[PDB]
Scaffold this active site. Sequence first.
Site, PDB file in Angstrom:
ATOM      1  N   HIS A  43      -7.429  23.010 -40.381  1.00 52.30           N
ATOM      2  CA  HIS A  43      -7.672  24.502 -40.575  1.00 52.30           C
ATOM      3  C   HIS A  43      -8.492  24.837 -38.805  1.00 52.30           C
ATOM      4  O   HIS A  43      -8.234  26.053 -38.921  1.00 52.30           O
ATOM      5  CB  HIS A  43      -8.238  25.513 -41.922  1.00 52.30           C
ATOM      6  CG  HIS A  43      -9.697  24.892 -41.684  1.00 52.30           C
ATOM      7  ND1 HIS A  43      -9.868  24.073 -42.436  1.00 52.30           N
ATOM      8  CD2 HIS A  43     -10.625  25.762 -41.934  1.00 52.30           C
ATOM      9  CE1 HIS A  43     -11.502  24.221 -42.650  1.00 52.30           C
ATOM     10  NE2 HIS A  43     -11.451  25.284 -41.662  1.00 52.30           N
ATOM     11  N   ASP A  99      -5.436  19.563 -46.294  1.00 51.78           N
ATOM     12  CA  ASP A  99      -6.222  20.435 -44.319  1.00 51.78           C
ATOM     13  C   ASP A  99      -6.155  19.121 -43.545  1.00 51.78           C
ATOM     14  O   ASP A  99      -7.060  18.921 -42.631  1.00 51.78           O
ATOM     15  CB  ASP A  99      -7.454  20.854 -45.396  1.00 51.78           C
ATOM     16  CG  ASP A  99      -7.993  21.967 -44.281  1.00 51.78           C
ATOM     17  OD1 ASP A  99      -8.079  22.253 -42.743  1.00 51.78           O
ATOM     18  OD2 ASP A  99      -8.469  22.840 -44.275  1.00 51.78           O
ATOM     19  N   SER A 205     -16.619  21.844 -41.030  1.00 51.71           N
ATOM     20  CA  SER A 205     -14.851  21.755 -41.755  1.00 51.71           C
ATOM     21  C   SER A 205     -14.480  20.459 -40.974  1.00 51.71           C
ATOM     22  O   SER A 205     -14.993  20.265 -39.050  1.00 51.71           O
ATOM     23  CB  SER A 205     -13.621  22.770 -41.167  1.00 51.71           C
ATOM     24  OG  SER A 205     -13.455  23.565 -42.517  1.00 51.71           O
TER      25      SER A 205
END
EC number: 3.4.21.5
Lengths: 259, 259, 159, 159
Positions: A43, A99, A205
């Site tokens: 992402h 992801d 992330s």
Amino acid sequence: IVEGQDAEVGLSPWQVMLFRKSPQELLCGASLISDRWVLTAAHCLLYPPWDKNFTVDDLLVRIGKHSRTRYERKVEKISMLDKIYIHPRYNWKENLDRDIALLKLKRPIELSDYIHPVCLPDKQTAAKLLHAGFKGRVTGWGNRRETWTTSVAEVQPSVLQVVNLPLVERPVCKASTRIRITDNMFCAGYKPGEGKRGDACEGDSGGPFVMKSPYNNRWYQMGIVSWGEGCDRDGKYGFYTHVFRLKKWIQKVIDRLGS
Amino acid sequence: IVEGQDAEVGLSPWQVMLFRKSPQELLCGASLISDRWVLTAAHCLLYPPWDKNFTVDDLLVRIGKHSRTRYERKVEKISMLDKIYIHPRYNWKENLDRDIALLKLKRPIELSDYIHPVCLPDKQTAAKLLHAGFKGRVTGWGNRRETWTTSVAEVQPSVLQVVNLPLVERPVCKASTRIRITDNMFCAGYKPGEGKRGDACEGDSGGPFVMKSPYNNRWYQMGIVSWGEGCDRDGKYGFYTHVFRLKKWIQKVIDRLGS
Amino acid sequence: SPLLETCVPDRGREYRGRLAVTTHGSRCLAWSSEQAKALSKDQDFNPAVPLAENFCRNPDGDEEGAWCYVADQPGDFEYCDLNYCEEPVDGDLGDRLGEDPDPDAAIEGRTSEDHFQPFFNEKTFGAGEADCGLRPLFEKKQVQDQTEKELFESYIEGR
Amino acid sequence: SPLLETCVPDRGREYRGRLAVTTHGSRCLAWSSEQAKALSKDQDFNPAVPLAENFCRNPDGDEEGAWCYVADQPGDFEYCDLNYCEEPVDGDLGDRLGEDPDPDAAIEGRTSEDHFQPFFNEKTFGAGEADCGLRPLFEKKQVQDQTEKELFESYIEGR
Ligand SMILES: *C[C@@](*)(O)[C@H](CCCNC(N)=[NH2+])NC(=O)[C@@H]1CCCN1C(=O)[C@H](N)Cc1ccccc1
Ligand SMILES: *C[C@@](*)(O)[C@H](CCCNC(N)=[NH2+])NC(=O)[C@@H]1CCCN1C(=O)[C@H](N)Cc1ccccc1
Ligand SMILES: *[C@@H]1O[C@H](CO)[C@@H](O[C@@H]2O[C@H](CO)[C@@H](O)[C@H](O)[C@H]2NC(C)=O)[C@H](O)[C@H]1NC(C)=O
Ligand SMILES: *[C@@H]1O[C@H](CO)[C@@H](O[C@@H]2O[C@H](CO)[C@@H](O)[C@H](O)[C@H]2NC(C)=O)[C@H](O)[C@H]1NC(C)=O
């Protein structure tokens, strides 16, 4: 990383910093897994509903650091990308299922005492350590708190940061949000009773959730920082991408690359 | 409809069998709100993911019946369609929000003992009856059990069936399913302890959920059978279109259809 | 619909129907196409039931159900509203196996090494696997890092 | 994104941003286009903020966010991933009131009739309303329904 302490110079040498070149801006983080390939949260490179879609020319990588700012003249290794592989079924419409991404340096970076590859778990050690109650580590330069009065500047850790987080029972996992937790994710973080705080917030992330193997005392990466609702929120547990499951893909991509 | 008895001849004259002319098969139920309009659940006519797109020229109506089969030569009234008015924002892509349609008959049917209309609630009686604990009924030729061994023939009621279910606290409702519930949705059924089963099973959609008033003892339509998970599962509750909250729309649709 | 088909089991795995439309309400692409045969070109599918034309299928054994491919870019697929039987499983953490990688050839059996064992070929993966995990200023330099101790106490348990 | 635009409160009610996309990852119709002009024509759009071009707006006070129209048929609209603030409020049943209908014209006040009130004009709505809710073979015949009583003690309560 919320409620975490500063990291020691030299601690996590697979801690990659992935940031876009113009404007210069810190996007996510990542892990060096070999001398030439890098793992990161998909992402970070693409998210259709927010109009996110960087290409190779858009962003460079920075391996071997400490302060998320200050050219560390000696130790770093700024380097450009080449590949960028996102999973064909990185469910970006619904719940960031898979992801996982997989960058490639332009030219193999050289190893050092500050630049060293983490390990991709194998089925065996993956069995023994994946148990609710054991802890791990999620590192990164992502935001300290979850909000700020004015300017997010005031909530950006100076040096690297680290926090030791514990794996929860998939049941309580499912039970924290209507967001469909998939077979291949795992939520970690303390319990409402437990007393301790800590959580990988925004900006985190891609940063890996590494676990030390008592046997062979090597460091392994079980997960990747993927999604969560806010930060350190009593009730909500942060989620991570189950790298062990997706490992078969990583294989399928990497060795298909020519030779 | 599950764990409910057969309805008295004339217990609910506003009941509407809505079925397709070819091939001949029962589709949904619905309700007679006037002598020319009929209120129904939207997912009876439209649900793309399934290939559900019936036009006026596809389905006919039967006002006044009793047994879900047998031409009731003296009492029923098979007529033709005119409208089919779905809601502009009928959320069929995610949670069937606003599952409400608005069929208009070709020519105003002849009222009768066996064919009589039901009332739409008003903001006053509304506030009054919608309390968690009060009961209401739901009528339908829809399936008795949830399954069969072979052929659903072995689970379809011979005649109109009835059950009274009690309203449940929205808070519990939420708890029931991952499927996002909206402002205009309301669940009704008994809880796991209570000891009384019953529910609108598949094929009951459209039939009204109606209560009787403690003032003016007239019958009012509080909901529309919409969705649910299985049929009569302990731990789950049937969800209904909150007709009242969508009342203003109906007014727009109808009252702008001419003079 | 009452007179519809039966309740689709095994999370649509063994599904062999004909629905070619997604929950989003979108079309569907030919399992074998200029688009879908490139996205598939990386995964780990499985037979069970063929990939007939463009009908929703669950080749990878995806536990959330059968899906279609909607376009060409990554993540451009979508699930199908197949009307499955029971709610999906909740495999307690390491409850769902994920029988992982082979030494580039399926089924180990004759598997032996020194004390680590690579799984990436070296030619392409690059360098550093053999001694990954061993941080230089620590494990190699036999010095512990500040909280390692804490990570450790978790493992074996305190209760 | 960390440096991103601030939080989105009131569930996106007074949100004037410029995102032209949906969570399903699609386009977004111009609010005053043929298509979008129609679907809305019959709902209830309060102001709050302008309908600016084709930007995700919450023009109905939809308390699940702001959204777009992705086409022309009913339901062809999608919510936007605005990244809202706090967990949406869950009103206890009737707790989301709903100030429903006027005598076709704004506000009641000067309102008085027999005992019911045909909130439907008669012309377009048709015959019935007046004697609605009263079953030919029961209440009009002062005869009780087999379970009417059971439905009754409900309001009386057993506690
Ligand atoms: C992109 C990463 O830096 C970031 C990680 C921080 C999340 N919080 C915690 N405590 N781990 N990921 C995100 O912010 C992702 C990106 C997409 C939205 N998102 C979320 O966590 C939303 N808050 C929730 C969500 C939205 C859509 C799909 C899945 C989850
Ligand atoms: C069309 C109606 O007959 C039927 C009513 C079933 C209600 N069940 C109970 N136990 N009260 N509606 C449906 O079956 C709706 C329409 C689409 C399918 N559906 C469901 O309820 C599914 N079982 C689940 C669902 C899918 C999508 C969105 C919401 C729910
Ligand atoms: C992200 O950017 C790339 C541009 O490099 C887009 O790639 C093109 O995508 C279209 C539509 O899928 C294809 O027809 C082109 O052939 C692609 N070009 C290349 C060079 O790959 C990609 O689609 C973008 N993703 C999104 C969601 O916009
Ligand atoms: C259901 O079938 C109707 C047939 O009337 C479709 O209506 C047409 O839809 C297209 C695309 O939206 C329009 O361009 C036409 O003008 C419509 N014609 C009429 C007479 O309405 C409708 O779109 C179909 N709906 C779905 C969801 O498939």
